[PDB]
């Protein structure tokens, strides 16, 4: 296995295309820079890692092996070609077609529902983190990030939950179809802002338990909430309908993913390919 090309840097560390040289079996290698000052990794982090590495299924990008020495964790990963965000930058006037949103999230919510009643939960879920090839695939890698994050996490509960997931597949799905981020935070407040300006200033009644959440503050600024067709122009009734009930403030409300998969939105999905030019 060699480095053929770079696809992802950042904070973390960095993302390699490698290419076994006999095989041409090609992996995606993501480097990490541990910090621990000789240490190695915290037993806590391969655990967790190690983990996920039980994970099996169509939509979830395989955690082939994990690697680490004293100073550097390796995750080797199944490889694709191309991310949901480089996509839709990809896809910004004429959009991604109707029929091809519906198929990514009907198959990123098999792979939650999967995920999910294996107890396991994501909690990063971007555009980045959803990887694409040209058969019409969608899969769930890496196991801002602030623009996703669901509004419990953001007021600091100290326990979440697989809500937590459906959230942010929940702004991935309104991003594909407005062809913007639904909540673009410029900071933490913004962010929540954002969120009350849409859906409305959260209290008991809307959702029981969000005074006791650590951020929360009785003097939040009170806006109504909007209706959907103002937020996801121009979906349909069946999805404003589903994307609600995915961006239910109340994480006990929030629909669930193998819910989720019944609702009429998903009558009459298909599996469209997308135009690619790797
Ligand atoms: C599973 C560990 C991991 O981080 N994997 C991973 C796979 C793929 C990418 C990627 N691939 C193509 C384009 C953009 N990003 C990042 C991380």
Redesign the pocket.
């Known amino acids: 296995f060699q480095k053929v090309e770079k696809?992802?840097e950042g904070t973390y560390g960095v993302?390699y295309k490698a290419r076994n040289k006999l095989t041409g079996e090609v992996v995606?290698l993501?480097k990490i820079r541990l910090d621990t000052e000789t240490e190695g990794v915290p037993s806590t982090a391969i655990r967790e890692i190690s983990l996920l590495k039980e994970l099996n299924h169509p939509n979830i990008?395989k955690?082939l092996d994990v690697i680490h020495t004293e100073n550097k964790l390796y995750?080797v990963?199944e490889?694709?070609?191309?991310?949901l965000k480089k996509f839709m930058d990809a896809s910004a006037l004429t959009g991604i077609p109707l029929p091809l949103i519906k198929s990514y999230l009907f198959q990123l919510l098999q792979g939650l529902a999967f995920c999910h009643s294996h107890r396991v939960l994501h909690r990063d879920l971007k555009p980045?983190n959803l990887?694409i090839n040209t058969e019409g695939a969608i899969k769930l890698?890496?196991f801002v990030t602030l623009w996703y994050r669901a509004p419990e996490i953001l007021l600091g509960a100290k326990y979440y939950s697989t809500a937590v997931d459906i959230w942010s597949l929940g702004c991935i799905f309104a991003e594909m179809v407005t062809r913007r981020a639904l909540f673009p935070g410029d900071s933490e407040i913004d962010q929540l802002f954002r969120i009350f300006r849409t859906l409305g200033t959260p209290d008991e009644v809307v959702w029981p338990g969000v005074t006791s959440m650590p951020d929360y503050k009785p003097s939040f600024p009170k806006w109504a909430r909007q209706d959907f067709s103002k937020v996801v122009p121009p979906l349909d009734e069946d999805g404003r309908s589903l994307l609600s009930q995915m961006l239910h403030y109340d994480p006990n409300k929030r629909i669930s993913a193998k819910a989720a998969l019944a609702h009429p939105f998903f009558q009459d999905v298909t599996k469209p390919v997308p135009h690619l030019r790797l």
């Open positions: 696809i992802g993302v995606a993501k990008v955690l995750l990963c490889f694709l070609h191309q991310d980045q990887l890698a890496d």
